[PDB]
Design a protein around this ligand. Structure first.
Ligand code: UVA
Lengths: 412, 412
C-alpha cells in the first residue's frame, strides 16, 4: 500500500501578485496580469505584451551577490520555494533533513542569461562569459540552490516537460512521499521566457496572440476570437508532506493530493489531437490513481491556453471522460487572467485548484464573450462561482504531447 | 506492489562509436575518443578539444526534413532510443502502447540551436528566428519526438539534473515500471553542449582540462596531474521492462536493475564535499533499495570526471560505504576514454556497467599514470581486467549537489 500526501505550504510569483494571497485575490476578482512588456525594445515583434512579474525584490530572499549569479527563472523558483517552506511552518533538523527533497522544474530555463552571455560572446569573444553562466542558467539549480540554502538532503531533481513541468514536478514529488523515499518535498516550476528569444521563438511559430491593442483581452480560452496563448513569467511551489508527518507537528493542511496521471499523445510536436484522446487517458489515469469515479469531480483547472486546437481538444477530452457529468462540473482557465507561465503553469494552477477547495469557489474564465462551436460546458465565464467542490483536477498538456493531471480532494 | 525491472535493449552514440558494440570495443581496448574539435574555431578558447561524435548519419534514423529542425542533442537522443528499441525486439501495438513510455533527459539541451538563433536575433532581428526554435531546442522533445515516431502513449517526461541526468532518468523510469505506471520505458540521456557558450561557460568556470597539446591524455581520473573534465557529446538509451512482461515475450535480458539511490549534498552549487558524504548517502540508499550486503559489489563505474575535488570525494565515499571491501571491488572511470557526456554520462555508463556484467570485465581507467594521495583502490589502471562481476554500480554526481546511483546484477 501507499502513504497519503497533503499540501501544507504554498508560494507563488505571478502576473497577478508577488505571493499566493495577492494572486488568488486577482483570480477571484477576474483581474488580468497582462500588459505591454517594459524595459525591452519589441518594435520588430508581432507580440509586445505578456504577464510580467511586477515589483520582484530578490533581496527579500538572496544577497545582491547571490542573485547576480542566477537567471530570473531560478530567482522566481527560490522565491516561491522560500515562501512555500515558510508557509508550511516546517522545521528542518539533522533528524529529518535526509527525508526532505526538492523537485522544482522549468520548461525553457535560462534564456535571459543565455541572451546576455551571447551578447558578450559575439561582441567580445569567449573570455567575457560569466564563470557562473552554467550553474546560474541550468534548470536543476532551483532544486540545487534550495537544497543548499535549507540543508535538504532528500530526493533532489528537476523535471522539464515544456508546459507540463509544474504538474509533472508536483505529481512525481507526491510519488516520492507515497512510496516512502521522502516525508516532505518542495515541488513546482518557475519560468522567465519573456525575453527576445522567448517572444521571438514563439512569435516565429505564430503560437502567440498578437492582440497588441487590448493585451487584457488577448487570453480568451474557448472564445471564438482567440488567436493563440499569452506568454507569462513566474513560479509556484508547494510543500507536499506525508499525512502522519503533517499531523504529528500539527501542520495546517490545505488539501490532499489523491491522484496523479501521465499520458503521451504520440500525435504532433506542438498540436494536440482534435478529440483530446491523450488528455482523456491522462485524466482517467489520474482518477483511477485516486480510486475516484469521474462523477465525483467538481472543478477542473483546464490547461486552457487560448490556442484554437488546444481549447477545443480539452472540451472533447472532458466530454469523453465525464459523459453525463461533463456539464455538472465547473471548468475554467485561470490563463484568461495569468496567461501561460509555461513550465510554471501547472504549479500556480495546482495552487489555484487547492484554493478553490479551501474557498469553495470556481475561478472565472474571463474574456469568454462568445463560446466557440461545442464550448457549451460550464466554463465559469466572466465572474467567479461559489459552489460545492470536494474534488478538483488540474490539467497540463504540453509540446511533444506530454500530459499531466493532478487530483486534489478537500481534507478534514 | 513492487515489480522487478530488466534491460532488454541498449543504444548509444559516444566519442568511441555510432553504436554500443563499437563503443564497447573501444572501452575494452583503452581507446580515447578525445580530439581537437573541428566543427568550430576555438583559437580564442582555453580548451579546444572534446569527445565529438564522429561521422553520425542522422539519415539512418530520420528524414533530412525533420533532422534540420532538431538540435543535435535531440538527433543524438532519437538515434540512441531507436537503437535500444530495435535491440529490444519489442513491437508496439494497440494492446501495449499505453504501457510504454520514455524518459530521455539532458543537462543543458539545445544550446547550439539557442546560440545560432541568438546570433540571428542580434545580427539580423527576431524575424530570422526559426519557427522550430522552441520545439527543436527544449529538453523534453527527445521524449516527445520518440513517442510520435514509435506511438508510445505511456508516461512521457524528461529530467534535467546536470551531470546526474542519465542515472536519475534510468532510476525513475525503473520506478514507473516497478510501481505499475508502465511495463516498458525507454530511458537515458543525450548531450551536445560543444558550442561557444558550452566550452566558453565551462572555460569561464575553469572546470575543463586545458591540455590542448595532448587531448587523449587530458581525462586522467585519480591521476595526480588532472586539471578538469573533458567535455563530450553523445547519447545512451536502455529499454527497461517489467520482468514477467520480458519473460512473457521471450526477451533477451542483459541484466536486472535492482537498486536506485538519490541524495543531495546540500553543500555547494558546483563543488562536491571532499568527504563524499552525499555520494555515500546515495550509494547506501541504492544498496538498501537492492537488499544487498555492500560486499556483494564487484564493479563500480565511477562518475570519475578528472576534477581535483570530484575524484578524491568519490574515493572517500567508496571507502566510507564499503570499508575493507573497498579494497576488493574494481572501480574505473570510462570518462578516461569517453570524456564527460554530462547529462548523457549516466546513460552510456549504465550501458558500460551492464556490458561489464555480460562480459565479466572491468573497463580500464586509462591515463592513471600516478594515482593521487589516498587513491589506493583497484582503479583498473591502463588495461581492462577480466573478473567475477555479479553486482555492478554506476554513480553520477552533478551541480546542485545532486547524486544518483544505479545497481545492476546478472539475471538467471
Ligand atoms: C516511487 N517513485 C515513483 C513512482 C512512480 C512514478 C515516479 C516515481 S519517482 C520518479 O519519484 O521515482
Amino acid at each position: 500500500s501507499r502513504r497519503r500526501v497533503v499540501i501544507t505550504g504554498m508560494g507563488m510569483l505571478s502576473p497577478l501578485g508577488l505571493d499566493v494571497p495577492s494572486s488568488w485575490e486577482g483570480i477571484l476578482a477576474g483581474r488580468s496580469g497582462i500588459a505591454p512588456i517594459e524595459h525591452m525594445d519589441l518594435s520588430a515583434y508581432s507580440t509586445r505584451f505578456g504577464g510580467s512579474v511586477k515589483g520582484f525584490n530578490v533581496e527579500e530572499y538572496l544577497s545582491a551577490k547571490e542573485a547576480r549569479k542566477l537567471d530570473l527563472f531560478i530567482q522566481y523558483g527560490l522565491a516561491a520555494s522560500f515562501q512555500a517552506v515558510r508557509d508550511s511552518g516546517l522545521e528542518v533538523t539533522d533528524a529529518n533533513r535526509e527525508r526532505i527533497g526538492v523537485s522544482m522544474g522549468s520548461g525553457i530555463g535560462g534564456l535571459t542569461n543565455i541572451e546576455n552571455n551571447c551578447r558578450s560572446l559575439f561582441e567580445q569573444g569567449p573570455r567575457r562569459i560569466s564563470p557562473f553562466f552554467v550553474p546560474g542558467s541550468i534548470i536543476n539549480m532551483v532544486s540545487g540552490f534550495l537544497s543548499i540554502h535549507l540543508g535538504l538532503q532528500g530526493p533532489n531533481y528537476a523535471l522539464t516537460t515544456a508546459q507540463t513541468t509544474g504538474t509533472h514536478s508536483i505529481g512525481m514529488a507526491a510519488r516520492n512521499i507515497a512510496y516512502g523515499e521522502a516525508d516532505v518535498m518542495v515541488a513546482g516550476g518557475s519560468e522567465m521566457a519573456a525575453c527576445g528569444l522567448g517572444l521571438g521563438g514563439f512569435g516565429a511559430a505564430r503560437a502567440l496572440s498578437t492582440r497588441n491593442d487590448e493585451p487584457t483581452r488577448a487570453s480568451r480560452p474557448w472564445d471564438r476570437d482567440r488567436d493563440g496563448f499569452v506568454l507569462s513569467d513566474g513560479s509556484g511551489a508547494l510543500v507536499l508532506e506525508e499525512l502522519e508527518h503533517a499531523r504529528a507537528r500539527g501542520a495546517r493542511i490545505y488539501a490532499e493530493l489523491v491522484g496523479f496521471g501521465m499520458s503521451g499523445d504520440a500525435f504532433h510536436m506542438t498540436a494536440p489531437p482534435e478529440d483530446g484522446a491523450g488528455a482523456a487517458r491522462c485524466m482517467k489515469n489520474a482518477l483511477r490513481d485516486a480510486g475516484l469515479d469521474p462523477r465525483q469531480v467538481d472543478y477542473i483547472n483546464a490547461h486552457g491556453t487560448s490556442t484554437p486546437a488546444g481549447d477545443i481538444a480539452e472540451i472533447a477530452a472532458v466530454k469523453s471522460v465525464f459523459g453525463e457529468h461533463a456539464h455538472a462540473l465547473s471548468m475554467s482557465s485561470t490563463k484568461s487572467m495569468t496567461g501561460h507561465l509555461l513550465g510554471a503553469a501547472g504549479a500556480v494552477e495546482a495552487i489555484f485548484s487547492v484554493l478553490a477547495l479551501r474557498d469553495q469557489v470556481a475561478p472565472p474564465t474571463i474574456n469568454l464573450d462568445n463560446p466557440d462551436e461545442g464550448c457549451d460546458l460550464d466554463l465559469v465565464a466572466h465572474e467567479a462561482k461559489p459552489r460545492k467542490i470536494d474534488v478538483a483536477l488540474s490539467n497540463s498538456f504540453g509540446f511533444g504531447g506530454t500530459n499531466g493531471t493532478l487530483v486534489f480532494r478537500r481534507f478534514a
